[PDB]
Amino acid sequence: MNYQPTPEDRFTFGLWTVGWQGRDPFGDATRRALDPVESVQRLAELGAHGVTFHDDDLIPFGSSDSEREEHVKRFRQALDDTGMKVPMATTNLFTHPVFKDGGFTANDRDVRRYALRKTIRNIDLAVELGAETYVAWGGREGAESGGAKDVRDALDRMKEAFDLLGEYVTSQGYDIRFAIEPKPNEPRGDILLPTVGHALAFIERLERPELYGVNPEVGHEQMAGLNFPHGIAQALWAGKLFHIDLNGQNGIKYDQDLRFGAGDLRAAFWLVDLLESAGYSGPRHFDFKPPRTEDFDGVWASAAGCMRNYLILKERAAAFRADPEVQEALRASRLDELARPTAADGLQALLDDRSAFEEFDVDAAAARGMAFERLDQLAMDHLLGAR
Amino acid sequence: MNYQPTPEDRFTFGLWTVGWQGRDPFGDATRRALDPVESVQRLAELGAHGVTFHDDDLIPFGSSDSEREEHVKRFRQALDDTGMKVPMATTNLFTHPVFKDGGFTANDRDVRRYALRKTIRNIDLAVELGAETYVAWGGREGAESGGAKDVRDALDRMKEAFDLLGEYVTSQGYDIRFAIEPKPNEPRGDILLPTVGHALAFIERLERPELYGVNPEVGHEQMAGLNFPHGIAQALWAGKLFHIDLNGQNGIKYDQDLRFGAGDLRAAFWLVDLLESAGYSGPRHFDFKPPRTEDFDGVWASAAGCMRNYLILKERAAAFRADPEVQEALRASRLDELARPTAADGLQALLDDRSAFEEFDVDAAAARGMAFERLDQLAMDHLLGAR
Amino acid sequence: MNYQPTPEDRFTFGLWTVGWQGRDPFGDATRRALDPVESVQRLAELGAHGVTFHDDDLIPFGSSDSEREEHVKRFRQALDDTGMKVPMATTNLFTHPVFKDGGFTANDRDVRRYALRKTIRNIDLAVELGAETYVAWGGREGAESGGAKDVRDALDRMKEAFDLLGEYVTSQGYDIRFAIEPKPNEPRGDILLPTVGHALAFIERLERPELYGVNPEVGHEQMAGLNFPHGIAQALWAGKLFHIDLNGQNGIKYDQDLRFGAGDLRAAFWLVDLLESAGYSGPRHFDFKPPRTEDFDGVWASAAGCMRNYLILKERAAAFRADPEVQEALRASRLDELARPTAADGLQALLDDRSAFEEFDVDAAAARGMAFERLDQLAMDHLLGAR
Amino acid sequence: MNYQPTPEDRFTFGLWTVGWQGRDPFGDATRRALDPVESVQRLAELGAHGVTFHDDDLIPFGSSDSEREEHVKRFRQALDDTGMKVPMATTNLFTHPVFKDGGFTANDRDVRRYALRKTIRNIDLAVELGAETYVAWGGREGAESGGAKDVRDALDRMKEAFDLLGEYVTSQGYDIRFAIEPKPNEPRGDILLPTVGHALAFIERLERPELYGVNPEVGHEQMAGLNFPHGIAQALWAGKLFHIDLNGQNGIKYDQDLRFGAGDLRAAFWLVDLLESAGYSGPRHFDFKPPRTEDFDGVWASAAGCMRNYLILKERAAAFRADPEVQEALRASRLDELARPTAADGLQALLDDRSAFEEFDVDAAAARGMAFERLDQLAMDHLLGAR
Ligand SMILES: OC[C@H]1OC[C@H](O)[C@@H](O)[C@@H]1O
Ligand SMILES: OC[C@H]1OC[C@H](O)[C@@H](O)[C@@H]1O
Ligand SMILES: OC[C@H]1OC[C@H](O)[C@@H](O)[C@@H]1O
Ligand SMILES: OC[C@H]1OC[C@H](O)[C@@H](O)[C@@H]1O
Ligand SMILES: [Mn+2]
Ligand SMILES: [Mn+2]
Ligand SMILES: [Mn+2]
Ligand SMILES: [Mn+2]
Ligand SMILES: [Mn+2]
Ligand SMILES: [Mn+2]
Ligand SMILES: [Mn+2]
Ligand SMILES: [Mn+2]
């Protein structure tokens, strides 16, 4: 009881994750810059299935079109040498000072045109490399002060940018979908579409909604004090869980990005319970930063523990759902009754049913216990291996 | 410079607001129970336009159908004597112990049938009394522990309950819409559809979405650390701001419900700026609790300051938008450019525009300042009357 | 692997905990009122060591002095019949409407005199029943608005109240100490001495500081987003961990009071690691509320899981500290070096040590990894039983 | 009604504030690097009284001792040319990768020796330049994971470091005090002494406590959801408000550092009310970052609005306290009674006073209203200039 990943677990990492050199808003870098080749080799050794990338993780901002190709060719060699895939790719529209007021909602209209052209060039690459999902994190879309952004106009510009992306993909015939990744704040004071629910809502107003879903990340819902497995339940109920970012976060503070398992560990248990019982079948992607305390040995430790923690919690969630005593408890708590329709008899029948009101014994019903605490300690004893 | 409401400002209060007897989770009541008649009289004197009610604020839980009528008739007299309206009404599906695991998503299916029948009886009343909007706050829909609620099944039950309400209203021919009011937590650990964005998303999956919008409340988005005027911008951009609850809240903690102005005062300025410049024309409804320190004189003080603060902030937001120097600033900050389409030239033109990429000077563009701090102190000097 | 408490584990519960009838700020009670006798019997059966009480949990507010005695005598019988102890007692200065603006810092001076007399009468009882610690939670000391409380004057009144308590105990010859329990907010907007650190600071200004320590509670530091085991480390470093309240809390929201283990489970692991390795030897007291979903079977389940979770986490923290690989890791991470003095050579030696500055190789030192991620996955594999 | 600072308002800025080049954890710098000379000139023109500095803001890390002197001499010239003072100085023990696990509590003992020697060299400079206060922000003292730092050992190392600093200052005969600046988190997961209350407590355990106070910052208490004017009240009640950092923050999130007034504006009103009515007479120091949207014109706008907002709020707090109606209200609310001793009659008299218990009419007393809402709208109408 040992927990060894293989490439079939679908574990992926961004280049920026094991590649983060530990430069924070108060500190210089503490690690040198990894070659993308490197990282591909090391990650394949650890059992990973693939990697993801921003355009500028792969090709240095500014690159000519003969360096560009060079970068790509090296990359491609390493994937072919290791068997690693590239399921997902994304654009950096945050680093470069030109992005300081956003990329698709920046007040300057020339910036907003340049954000779309940067994006479209990388969609073509991603498609080349075989990615299925193209993520958009608008981390610079938002404001520090209430008169600097009209939000209605800015959502109009964001819808315009996603609609022209949708056009371009369907005009090229590409098989690629888009996944918006919410974040509530940081590095802007407030970030537009700050949660999964605001990103799901916004999708429903694009021209082609079936092209877009979400990429929620553990630590960014938690940065609003929200229940991340409830978030993901709703995204699954909408049909829009295209991709996920897995990692940890200790409560409402700056975005920590700790390895997956760290943070809220019970939330991580019920998230694995839910992905595996809903049958999510996209990549289990880790968007994490190895703390800057760490050297490169710490880096590969940290990326391994991500995968380990995922497999342990999988095993404990599967044994919980398999346990007859737990399935008895779930009946005692009437989760079987939550899955049945309230009134499949229809409205008229409901309205003529005296047992539904006139002759409903409210006291007898209020007196029933829900038996949730016994059910939740069962879940505790399963996660701790006490069962 | 004086700020006197009239019934044309559309100011409304819930019965439960000035009626709250100050019973908290650690303390007994500190004020006796007001007659609904009372409150109607006192509120009309203060300049209010109307009141709102839960079924059980008006008619005591349990009431026969000859007390029921009695209650209603008294009520009706007071409205006719004062000219007060009833724009909005709502159901109590939280107080009574039968609701302890929810009303439309309670695990027991009999409870869920009884929640719908209670609801439908009050829709008929509301319609009688002339309300235009029927609010649903599911404050007991949610969980304290992750195995006690399957969220996918529970959203299925919530959609079923709202769809049968929609059926019933359109079968009766009623002119009534529904407004879901999010809250992230309290009194459940976590509450389903915790934010405006999750409530907007959920709406898009009902059978008749055009019947449903939102009733956001200041202090409940703030309980997630979210920017309430950005929330309301998005609800306005979706066409779904049916009703609002106005009040204050100091940050991420239990739901304070302070009078409107208290709390985040700058957030209250940019919320009034936005309602009045978007032309919101529903009720300005105050969902607040006069602190339990207060006697009944404190109560009517507190409900007056709600209205005052709203009028002061209206005047300061109007003088800010009217000020030529502020309109110069907003051009300096390129809010005029945020309102223009990014690419009304279309995708092909964008892609053949060299000035959009190949010949876009990114340094010159990154060098421009956005001039937001000068713009935001203008907004500060306007709100403080320093202008 | 089974985890059975005994009275030697020092497990205690307040009467108010298993006794909470589930009345919340939106809902009526869902359970009838337990006799204190009852609770003493049931808790002894579960393995508990004792109970604690507010004056008004035991004797009904208002009680004559012949009911008073009656109450006490019954109580006393049950303790003698079960062997249960009463290590800690406390005053209700929150419920009764007279307390609405506080008890020792209420603006009315007559209230403040009545708070002290209520307190002193219960210190005499507590002493009768054998308690060693007298807790003070000033849950109504604080304000909703900034002009309603001058905080300097209020800390003067709080110091005056604690100094006269100290006088009274040392004039009576009682062996009793006091423990202040911080809470940051709820039911007041803001509560004075909101954290362990503000309560430790305040102690240092009383006349007899050696009489006072703290009673921190898991969920109340977490309500400020603070690291509860770091809090308790500091209280232990000051010599002031007199008593503790154990329970759970999911982040920054209203005070949930979930059973102990729920909430932040990793925080609960490092808190047990720290109490047991520092050798805390007071009561392990559970200040929790069985959710109002629950019937009385749910109640006793919930109070059992408190104790279970504590024993499981004890075992996992002991196996982590006992593991040779973990003790190697802790050397790799230089926790051995953190325990050594920086400069026991003294200031002059430090200043003449060239290896400390002039000839300190800062790059070589920055290059060392701290090896914390490998150390923290070891801790994860120990808590999950994966080791 | 105009609000013009002069050098007598005691307004100071850190070099790092107007000097921040806008490099964030997702973005490059958006402004070039200001010469310290520059900033001194520009700030004197705006009305400032002085500046503050980290060692490494002034002299580039690594500097020889002939560049060192050069740096200092230029600096000195600009102060002499403008009349600017240097009231406060501080050490950078956060940037350099050697600091990645802290400076005075870093696990490596050699680091901790090098942190103290860096510190002591800058105390000598500060003393040269005339500073009265030496701040310590331990922004890298803390941990991301619970086994990486034993907090008891780390507080022992922090006390050792502050005690040897105290020794060195009193051995040199310097007139300099120390001010610890709390922060709850960022850039570490958790930061030791996270609040004012934990920093006040810790002080009481140093060898010479009278040498140390606090430097609270608005936005860092707010990052715990705490009431910053209550914090500062307690620091004033302890005699330990040595210095302050003024700025804004919108709630519990990453450290924004917005100009002073932005953020919680009502909290800023009651903080100015309190500093000016307590007669705080240290520097009003602004620790803020001009957002990275801004060019250098935005920079000097932002630093001006800091000072403006402070003067406006001063005027509004003075007119509130001067208003007879407000002084009537404060009597109605019994703030006069909060300032009187509870029992200056002594314990025995309290205990023999029947009017204090046996014959205390609790109902009559609970029935009194506190009249706080009328008092708080008066405060609202004063801050908005509506009065
Ligand atoms: O999508 C791009 C990635 O870009 C950087 C963000 O910090 C991270 O959340 C994200 O997933
Ligand atoms: O909608 C009903 C009202 O019910 C009680 C809730 O606490 C309040 O938020 C709400 O607006
Ligand atoms: O100290 C008395 C007890 O009183 C009730 C409080 O809610 C709880 O935190 C506390 O421990
Ligand atoms: O004390 C030094 C200064 O150092 C940088 C910190 O971010 C700031 O809070 C502080 O005041
Ligand atoms: Mn993140
Ligand atoms: Mn991410
Ligand atoms: Mn509310
Ligand atoms: Mn509401
Ligand atoms: Mn609690
Ligand atoms: Mn407690
Ligand atoms: Mn700061
Ligand atoms: Mn600071």
JSON list of C-alpha atoms in Angstrom, two decimals, chain D residues 223-337:
[
{"chain": "D", "resi": 223, "resn": "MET", "atom": "CA", "xyz": [-6.83, 40.58, 5.84]},
{"chain": "D", "resi": 224, "resn": "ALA", "atom": "CA", "xyz": [-8.06, 38.77, 8.98]},
{"chain": "D", "resi": 225, "resn": "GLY", "atom": "CA", "xyz": [-11.59, 40.33, 8.82]},
{"chain": "D", "resi": 226, "resn": "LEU", "atom": "CA", "xyz": [-10.63, 42.33, 12.03]},
{"chain": "D", "resi": 227, "resn": "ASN", "atom": "CA", "xyz": [-11.86, 45.87, 13.02]},
{"chain": "D", "resi": 228, "resn": "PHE", "atom": "CA", "xyz": [-8.74, 48.02, 12.45]},
{"chain": "D", "resi": 229, "resn": "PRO", "atom": "CA", "xyz": [-9.80, 50.98, 14.67]},
{"chain": "D", "resi": 230, "resn": "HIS", "atom": "CA", "xyz": [-10.54, 48.47, 17.55]},
{"chain": "D", "resi": 231, "resn": "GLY", "atom": "CA", "xyz": [-7.04, 47.07, 17.04]},
{"chain": "D", "resi": 232, "resn": "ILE", "atom": "CA", "xyz": [-5.45, 50.46, 17.20]},
{"chain": "D", "resi": 233, "resn": "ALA", "atom": "CA", "xyz": [-7.65, 51.37, 20.38]},
{"chain": "D", "resi": 234, "resn": "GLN", "atom": "CA", "xyz": [-6.08, 48.33, 22.06]},
{"chain": "D", "resi": 235, "resn": "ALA", "atom": "CA", "xyz": [-2.55, 49.26, 20.92]},
{"chain": "D", "resi": 236, "resn": "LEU", "atom": "CA", "xyz": [-3.21, 52.81, 22.29]},
{"chain": "D", "resi": 237, "resn": "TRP", "atom": "CA", "xyz": [-4.58, 51.42, 25.56]},
{"chain": "D", "resi": 238, "resn": "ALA", "atom": "CA", "xyz": [-1.31, 49.41, 25.92]},
{"chain": "D", "resi": 239, "resn": "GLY", "atom": "CA", "xyz": [0.84, 52.42, 25.27]},
{"chain": "D", "resi": 240, "resn": "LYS", "atom": "CA", "xyz": [2.39, 50.73, 22.18]},
{"chain": "D", "resi": 241, "resn": "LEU", "atom": "CA", "xyz": [1.26, 52.66, 19.06]},
{"chain": "D", "resi": 242, "resn": "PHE", "atom": "CA", "xyz": [4.79, 53.63, 17.94]},
{"chain": "D", "resi": 243, "resn": "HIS", "atom": "CA", "xyz": [4.07, 54.06, 14.22]},
{"chain": "D", "resi": 244, "resn": "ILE", "atom": "CA", "xyz": [1.21, 53.26, 11.80]},
{"chain": "D", "resi": 245, "resn": "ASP", "atom": "CA", "xyz": [0.87, 52.27, 8.12]},
{"chain": "D", "resi": 246, "resn": "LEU", "atom": "CA", "xyz": [-2.03, 53.81, 6.40]},
{"chain": "D", "resi": 247, "resn": "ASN", "atom": "CA", "xyz": [-3.65, 52.38, 3.17]},
{"chain": "D", "resi": 248, "resn": "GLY", "atom": "CA", "xyz": [-6.83, 50.58, 2.01]},
{"chain": "D", "resi": 249, "resn": "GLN", "atom": "CA", "xyz": [-7.93, 47.06, 1.44]},
{"chain": "D", "resi": 250, "resn": "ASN", "atom": "CA", "xyz": [-11.22, 45.57, 0.13]},
{"chain": "D", "resi": 251, "resn": "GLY", "atom": "CA", "xyz": [-11.77, 42.64, 2.49]},
{"chain": "D", "resi": 252, "resn": "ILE", "atom": "CA", "xyz": [-10.10, 39.29, 2.96]},
{"chain": "D", "resi": 253, "resn": "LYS", "atom": "CA", "xyz": [-7.90, 38.67, -0.06]},
{"chain": "D", "resi": 254, "resn": "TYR", "atom": "CA", "xyz": [-4.28, 39.28, -1.17]},
{"chain": "D", "resi": 255, "resn": "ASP", "atom": "CA", "xyz": [-2.56, 42.44, 0.27]},
{"chain": "D", "resi": 256, "resn": "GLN", "atom": "CA", "xyz": [-3.85, 45.23, -2.00]},
{"chain": "D", "resi": 257, "resn": "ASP", "atom": "CA", "xyz": [-2.09, 48.25, -0.41]},
{"chain": "D", "resi": 258, "resn": "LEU", "atom": "CA", "xyz": [-4.54, 50.76, -2.14]},
{"chain": "D", "resi": 259, "resn": "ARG", "atom": "CA", "xyz": [-4.12, 54.41, -1.33]},
{"chain": "D", "resi": 260, "resn": "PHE", "atom": "CA", "xyz": [-5.49, 55.50, 1.98]},
{"chain": "D", "resi": 261, "resn": "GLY", "atom": "CA", "xyz": [-9.36, 56.24, 1.87]},
{"chain": "D", "resi": 262, "resn": "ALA", "atom": "CA", "xyz": [-9.84, 53.45, -0.62]},
{"chain": "D", "resi": 263, "resn": "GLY", "atom": "CA", "xyz": [-11.05, 50.20, 0.79]},
{"chain": "D", "resi": 264, "resn": "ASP", "atom": "CA", "xyz": [-13.20, 50.44, 3.79]},
{"chain": "D", "resi": 265, "resn": "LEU", "atom": "CA", "xyz": [-13.90, 54.14, 3.85]},
{"chain": "D", "resi": 266, "resn": "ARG", "atom": "CA", "xyz": [-16.07, 54.07, 7.14]},
{"chain": "D", "resi": 267, "resn": "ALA", "atom": "CA", "xyz": [-13.18, 52.23, 8.88]},
{"chain": "D", "resi": 268, "resn": "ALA", "atom": "CA", "xyz": [-10.81, 54.97, 7.65]},
{"chain": "D", "resi": 269, "resn": "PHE", "atom": "CA", "xyz": [-13.23, 57.68, 9.19]},
{"chain": "D", "resi": 270, "resn": "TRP", "atom": "CA", "xyz": [-13.32, 55.94, 12.59]},
{"chain": "D", "resi": 271, "resn": "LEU", "atom": "CA", "xyz": [-9.50, 55.40, 12.43]},
{"chain": "D", "resi": 272, "resn": "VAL", "atom": "CA", "xyz": [-8.86, 59.17, 11.90]},
{"chain": "D", "resi": 273, "resn": "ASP", "atom": "CA", "xyz": [-11.46, 59.98, 14.60]},
{"chain": "D", "resi": 274, "resn": "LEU", "atom": "CA", "xyz": [-9.50, 57.80, 16.95]},
{"chain": "D", "resi": 275, "resn": "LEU", "atom": "CA", "xyz": [-5.91, 58.89, 16.13]},
{"chain": "D", "resi": 276, "resn": "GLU", "atom": "CA", "xyz": [-6.85, 62.52, 16.30]},
{"chain": "D", "resi": 277, "resn": "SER", "atom": "CA", "xyz": [-8.89, 62.20, 19.50]},
{"chain": "D", "resi": 278, "resn": "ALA", "atom": "CA", "xyz": [-6.33, 60.07, 21.28]},
{"chain": "D", "resi": 279, "resn": "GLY", "atom": "CA", "xyz": [-3.62, 62.73, 20.07]},
{"chain": "D", "resi": 280, "resn": "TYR", "atom": "CA", "xyz": [-1.38, 60.21, 18.25]},
{"chain": "D", "resi": 281, "resn": "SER", "atom": "CA", "xyz": [1.61, 62.20, 17.39]},
{"chain": "D", "resi": 282, "resn": "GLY", "atom": "CA", "xyz": [3.82, 59.90, 15.29]},
{"chain": "D", "resi": 283, "resn": "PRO", "atom": "CA", "xyz": [4.14, 60.00, 11.47]},
{"chain": "D", "resi": 284, "resn": "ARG", "atom": "CA", "xyz": [1.11, 59.39, 9.27]},
{"chain": "D", "resi": 285, "resn": "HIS", "atom": "CA", "xyz": [2.90, 56.96, 7.06]},
{"chain": "D", "resi": 286, "resn": "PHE", "atom": "CA", "xyz": [1.46, 55.63, 3.77]},
{"chain": "D", "resi": 287, "resn": "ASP", "atom": "CA", "xyz": [2.34, 52.09, 2.88]},
{"chain": "D", "resi": 288, "resn": "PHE", "atom": "CA", "xyz": [0.54, 51.83, -0.48]},
{"chain": "D", "resi": 289, "resn": "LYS", "atom": "CA", "xyz": [1.23, 50.69, -4.10]},
{"chain": "D", "resi": 290, "resn": "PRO", "atom": "CA", "xyz": [0.06, 52.79, -6.98]},
{"chain": "D", "resi": 291, "resn": "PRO", "atom": "CA", "xyz": [-1.75, 50.26, -9.07]},
{"chain": "D", "resi": 292, "resn": "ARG", "atom": "CA", "xyz": [0.33, 48.88, -12.01]},
{"chain": "D", "resi": 293, "resn": "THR", "atom": "CA", "xyz": [-2.36, 50.35, -14.47]},
{"chain": "D", "resi": 294, "resn": "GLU", "atom": "CA", "xyz": [-0.77, 53.70, -13.70]},
{"chain": "D", "resi": 295, "resn": "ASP", "atom": "CA", "xyz": [2.02, 55.70, -15.32]},
{"chain": "D", "resi": 296, "resn": "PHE", "atom": "CA", "xyz": [4.18, 58.10, -13.21]},
{"chain": "D", "resi": 297, "resn": "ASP", "atom": "CA", "xyz": [1.49, 60.85, -13.35]},
{"chain": "D", "resi": 298, "resn": "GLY", "atom": "CA", "xyz": [-0.94, 58.16, -11.86]},
{"chain": "D", "resi": 299, "resn": "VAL", "atom": "CA", "xyz": [1.75, 57.58, -9.15]},
{"chain": "D", "resi": 300, "resn": "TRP", "atom": "CA", "xyz": [1.89, 61.11, -7.92]},
{"chain": "D", "resi": 301, "resn": "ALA", "atom": "CA", "xyz": [-1.96, 61.40, -8.11]},
{"chain": "D", "resi": 302, "resn": "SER", "atom": "CA", "xyz": [-2.35, 58.30, -5.99]},
{"chain": "D", "resi": 303, "resn": "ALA", "atom": "CA", "xyz": [0.24, 59.60, -3.28]},
{"chain": "D", "resi": 304, "resn": "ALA", "atom": "CA", "xyz": [-1.54, 62.99, -3.27]},
{"chain": "D", "resi": 305, "resn": "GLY", "atom": "CA", "xyz": [-5.04, 61.33, -2.83]},
{"chain": "D", "resi": 306, "resn": "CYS", "atom": "CA", "xyz": [-3.55, 59.54, 0.32]},
{"chain": "D", "resi": 307, "resn": "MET", "atom": "CA", "xyz": [-2.91, 62.80, 2.01]},
{"chain": "D", "resi": 308, "resn": "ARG", "atom": "CA", "xyz": [-6.13, 64.49, 0.75]},
{"chain": "D", "resi": 309, "resn": "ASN", "atom": "CA", "xyz": [-8.27, 61.65, 2.09]},
{"chain": "D", "resi": 310, "resn": "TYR", "atom": "CA", "xyz": [-6.66, 61.86, 5.45]},
{"chain": "D", "resi": 311, "resn": "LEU", "atom": "CA", "xyz": [-7.37, 65.65, 5.67]},
{"chain": "D", "resi": 312, "resn": "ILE", "atom": "CA", "xyz": [-10.95, 65.40, 4.49]},
{"chain": "D", "resi": 313, "resn": "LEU", "atom": "CA", "xyz": [-11.66, 62.62, 7.05]},
{"chain": "D", "resi": 314, "resn": "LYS", "atom": "CA", "xyz": [-10.00, 64.61, 9.76]},
{"chain": "D", "resi": 315, "resn": "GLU", "atom": "CA", "xyz": [-12.22, 67.59, 9.10]},
{"chain": "D", "resi": 316, "resn": "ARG", "atom": "CA", "xyz": [-15.46, 65.31, 9.06]},
{"chain": "D", "resi": 317, "resn": "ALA", "atom": "CA", "xyz": [-14.42, 63.51, 12.33]},
{"chain": "D", "resi": 318, "resn": "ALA", "atom": "CA", "xyz": [-13.70, 66.83, 14.13]},
{"chain": "D", "resi": 319, "resn": "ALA", "atom": "CA", "xyz": [-17.06, 68.40, 12.96]},
{"chain": "D", "resi": 320, "resn": "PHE", "atom": "CA", "xyz": [-18.86, 65.06, 14.19]},
{"chain": "D", "resi": 321, "resn": "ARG", "atom": "CA", "xyz": [-17.26, 65.33, 17.70]},
{"chain": "D", "resi": 322, "resn": "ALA", "atom": "CA", "xyz": [-17.84, 69.06, 17.83]},
{"chain": "D", "resi": 323, "resn": "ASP", "atom": "CA", "xyz": [-21.54, 68.86, 17.01]},
{"chain": "D", "resi": 324, "resn": "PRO", "atom": "CA", "xyz": [-23.73, 69.53, 20.17]},
{"chain": "D", "resi": 325, "resn": "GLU", "atom": "CA", "xyz": [-26.43, 67.12, 18.67]},
{"chain": "D", "resi": 326, "resn": "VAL", "atom": "CA", "xyz": [-23.82, 64.40, 18.42]},
{"chain": "D", "resi": 327, "resn": "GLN", "atom": "CA", "xyz": [-22.63, 65.09, 22.05]},
{"chain": "D", "resi": 328, "resn": "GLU", "atom": "CA", "xyz": [-26.37, 64.86, 23.22]},
{"chain": "D", "resi": 329, "resn": "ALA", "atom": "CA", "xyz": [-26.64, 61.54, 21.22]},
{"chain": "D", "resi": 330, "resn": "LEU", "atom": "CA", "xyz": [-23.45, 60.14, 22.86]},
{"chain": "D", "resi": 331, "resn": "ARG", "atom": "CA", "xyz": [-25.15, 60.85, 26.27]},
{"chain": "D", "resi": 332, "resn": "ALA", "atom": "CA", "xyz": [-28.32, 59.25, 25.10]},
{"chain": "D", "resi": 333, "resn": "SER", "atom": "CA", "xyz": [-26.28, 56.16, 24.29]},
{"chain": "D", "resi": 334, "resn": "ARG", "atom": "CA", "xyz": [-24.58, 56.27, 27.67]},
{"chain": "D", "resi": 335, "resn": "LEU", "atom": "CA", "xyz": [-20.97, 56.64, 26.37]},
{"chain": "D", "resi": 336, "resn": "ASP", "atom": "CA", "xyz": [-20.50, 58.98, 29.39]},
{"chain": "D", "resi": 337, "resn": "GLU", "atom": "CA", "xyz": [-21.40, 56.02, 31.64]}
]
